[PDB]
Design a protein around this ligand. Structure first.
Ligand code: IQP
Lengths: 336, 20
């Protein structure tokens, strides 16, 4: 591990310094269906006409990115995504830009979102939930080692693959930071107290969100929920959490450590770091190596009927792709 | 039940992230 990582940082650093650019054209892909929608761009199932392969293309309208002040966050996402490599992170195949939009072509992950499955099913069993949590633990350990903070962990950002494993997507708030950071971003339900409290934070926000995930997976609903964000923020800083009566004893305490308001007592930010998590009673059966190798028995395999099948994804209205005669935000996005 | 409460709530669908 410390060994594995050391080598991993070396590769990430190479890519960090020399990020790839315009590795494709819009015209090489056949637009097929929208798999998801964004606040300034959507995601489409697309087909590379030369290779016959399908991918998921993320399109971002340059002007909307500017109106929403997400330029640097958009630059972070691409730079970071093209440099990373782990079994549980989506692969950025290509990226290019044109007069109107920015494009990120990634590997298509046929299984759908963890969200849809969780919602439909209700709640996952601790064993099923732990299978997932363990993969997020290894991803964070990998991510933080490269000085990155993910910042948007939620069922909506985790995709299931043919093999029943996890694929983390959406690095829109990912940042390589040595030291503290101050942007208020993420999803309300998963916001750590420090963030909502505007005090400046580090990786520990990623360990809080994990606690919120495991809980949402095992209970079927978030530990803090209301109808309007302010009410949510209220519960989060309150430092009070109630556990469903079916949570195991080991789960109740793993969670009490991750959902530690005091980030100087919070698992993942202590002296032992991630080991305090990997070595917790709840994970006693977990064979970390076996998981990293994908040799464990996945409890659930979503089934897709052939390539390009999009049944595990919701139907969206198809807004048409428009591209201006004129370049739109050339200077802002020159490094993209 | 908390579950029932969550289901009748306004945030059961896909949650968007907060920018500004
Ligand atoms: C809904 C948007 C935003 N939320 C995370 C999932 N995505 S998405 O499902 O389109 C989505 C995003 C990025 C890569 C993908 C690969 N395959 C399938 C889907 C992919």
């Amino acid at each position: 591990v410390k060994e594995f990582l050391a080598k991993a940082k070396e590769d990430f650093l190479k890519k960090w310094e020399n990020p790839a650019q315009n590795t494709a054209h819009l015209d090489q892909f056949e637009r097929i269906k929208t798999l998801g929608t964004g606040s300034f761009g959507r995601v489409m199932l697309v087909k590379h006409m030369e290779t016959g392969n399908h991918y998921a293309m993320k399109i971002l309208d340059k002007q909307k990115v500017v109106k929403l002040k997400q330029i640097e966050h958009t630059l972070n996402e691409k730079r970071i995504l093209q440099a990373v490599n782990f079994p549980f992170l989506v692969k950025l195949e290509f990226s290019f830009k044109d007069n109107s939009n920015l494009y990120m072509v990634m590997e298509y992950v046929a299984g759908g979102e963890m969200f849809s499955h969780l919602r439909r099913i209700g709640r996952f069993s601790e064993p099923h939930a732990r299978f997932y949590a363990a993969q997020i633990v290894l991803t964070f350990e990998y991510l933080h080692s490269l000085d990155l903070i993910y910042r948007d962990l939620k069922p909506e950002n985790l995709l299931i693959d043919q093999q029943g494993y996890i694929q983390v997507t959406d690095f829109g708030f990912a940042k390589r930071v040595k030291g503290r950071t101050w942007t208020l971003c993420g999803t309300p339900e998963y916001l750590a107290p420090e963030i909502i409290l505007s005090k400046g934070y580090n990786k520990a926000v990623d360990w809080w969100a994990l606690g919120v995930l495991i809980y949402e997976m095992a209970a079927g609903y978030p530990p803090f929920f209301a109808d309007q964000p302010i009410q949510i923020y209220e519960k989060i800083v309150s430092g009070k959490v109630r556990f469903p009566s079916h949570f195991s004893s080991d789960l109740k305490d793993l969670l009490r450590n991750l959902l530690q308001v005091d980030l100087t007592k919070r698992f993942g930010n202590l002296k032992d770091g991630v080991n305090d998590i990997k070595n917790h009673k709840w994970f006693a059966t977990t064979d970390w190596i076996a998981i990293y190798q994908r040799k464990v028995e996945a409890p659930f395999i979503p089934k897709f009927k052939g390539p390009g099948d999009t049944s595990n994804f919701d139907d969206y209205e198809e807004e048409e792709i428009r591209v201006s005669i004129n370049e739109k935000c050339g200077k802002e996005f020159s490094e993209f | 039940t908390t579950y029932a409460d969550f289901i009748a709530s306004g945030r059961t669908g896909r949650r968007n992230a907060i920018h500004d």
